[PDB]
């Protein structure tokens, strides 16, 4: 899709394999903010957003937290606390036509900078001065959308570049996008190293029929320490008690 109409896709209920993306050499730019790319297999994500668009080669740097420019301020804005990955690669083989590929648009003029992660689709005529346009193009009536003149003869910086950005959000919800990890049978009443949807740690698992959890996934205590979890395979409530310790 065009920059001003960047597409977004929902991603959930996944055996997600990120190894094929990282090991592939087809991507010129692959930068992840907040997560190391090599550890992406282990994490479990609540929900995954995928945004896709095609931009000019000079403007790939503007797709980053805390960046200013025509496309960052007017077309696509990234929050300063963004966590996820950005992928970009050259697309001269498909988005270049000798007569000019004019199927891609970008916004030039708007009233004020747009808030992060929002889409503007209106094509109303921009009013740069005082004389009302009244829906008629002319003097003081500039169309905010401009077309990229993509051609195979463009310079390396003017080559079309396809950008796909993945955003991961983690919060108090049952994770549904996990990596390729084989599940093992659980053992109770023994100090083990559990891993429930990426919530690693240590302790003694115990059947806790006292707790109810009609719809709650996890339980917790005064501090940021989980006290009860539910087994994702078979739904029962398990208590976590830390292993004994003491001075000598």
């Amino acid at each position, epitope marked *: 899709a065009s920059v001003y109409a960047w597409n977004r896709k929902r991603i959930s209920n996944c055996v997600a394999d990120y190894s094929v993306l990282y090991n592939s050499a087809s991507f010129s730019t692959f930068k992840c903010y907040g997560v190391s790319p090599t550890k992406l297999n282990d994490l479990c994500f609540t929900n995954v957003y995928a945004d896709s668009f095609v931009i000019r080669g000079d403007e790939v740097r503007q797709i980053a937290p805390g960046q200013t420019g025509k496309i960052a301020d007017y077309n696509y804005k990234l929050p300063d606390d963004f966590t996820g990955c950005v992928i970009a690669w050259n697309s001269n*083989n*498909l988005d270049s*036509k000798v007569g000019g590929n004019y199927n891609y648009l970008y916004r030039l003029f708007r009233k004020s900078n747009l808030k992060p992660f929002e889409r503007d689709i209106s094509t109303e005529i921009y009013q740069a001065g005082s004389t009302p346009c009244n829906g008629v193009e002319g003097f003081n009536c500039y169309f905010p959308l401009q077309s990229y003149g993509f051609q195979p003869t463009n310079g390396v910086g003017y080559q079309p570049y396809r950008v796909v950005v993945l955003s991961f959000e983690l919060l108090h919800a049952p994770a549904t996008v996990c990596g390729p990890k084989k599940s093992t049978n659980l053992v109770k009443n023994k100090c083990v190293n559990f891993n429930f949807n990426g919530l690693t740690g240590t302790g003694v698992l115990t059947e806790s029929n006292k707790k109810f959890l009609p719809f709650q996934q996890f339980g917790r205590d005064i501090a940021d320490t989980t006290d009860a979890v539910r087994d994702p395979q078979t739904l029962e409530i398990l208590d976590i008690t830390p292993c004994s310790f003491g001075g000598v």
Partner: antibody
Amino acid sequence: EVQLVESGGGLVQPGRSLRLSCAASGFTFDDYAMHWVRQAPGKGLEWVSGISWNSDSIDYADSVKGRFTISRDNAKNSLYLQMNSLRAEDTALYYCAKDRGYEILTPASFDYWGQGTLVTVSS
Amino acid sequence: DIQMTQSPSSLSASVGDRVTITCRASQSISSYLNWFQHKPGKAPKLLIYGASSLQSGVPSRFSGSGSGTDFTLTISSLQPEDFATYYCQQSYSTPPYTFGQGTKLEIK
């Protein structure tokens, strides 16, 4: 694994018209571009025409401008090529190629081909 | 305009030799060349898209290289099912899809 079968070939007198068809079933036809490639009996390959994923941009070879009219039908997954005003130099072999991209004039090349159909122009 | 030339026309080799074929263009095309394997009895097939990118599903024996104006295709093993005619095509200039002449390859 994609299939591209052609028909309509044969022998016609010079100045007469004939039509070709090429049915595709092994892939998604509504978003790819297609071309037609001619192979002379004793020469190399030569491009003839091409159409976009939707019938907006159409280009023709220099030697066949004003004579050939390529068409496309996205509903029945088939494209056509109406050959008009044939002369003695069009007795070659015609293929039904598939473009890798969605446009007509792109650096992308022809990805899948099909077996040619033989035409002849003589008395 | 643009002109496309083929230095070799007919080559001879064996089952265990190495063969290189070169394709030359009149003007710079910036790594936009394609190689096709045309069997005399069936439909021609593409081997290399772009300057040195190998298409999926074909053996890695075929290897292409070159950029600018001169290009070359190299074959390493010469399996006995590799007899065909090979064409090089440019997709960069105003004359659309110009094909070079054939390059017959027979093994003896």
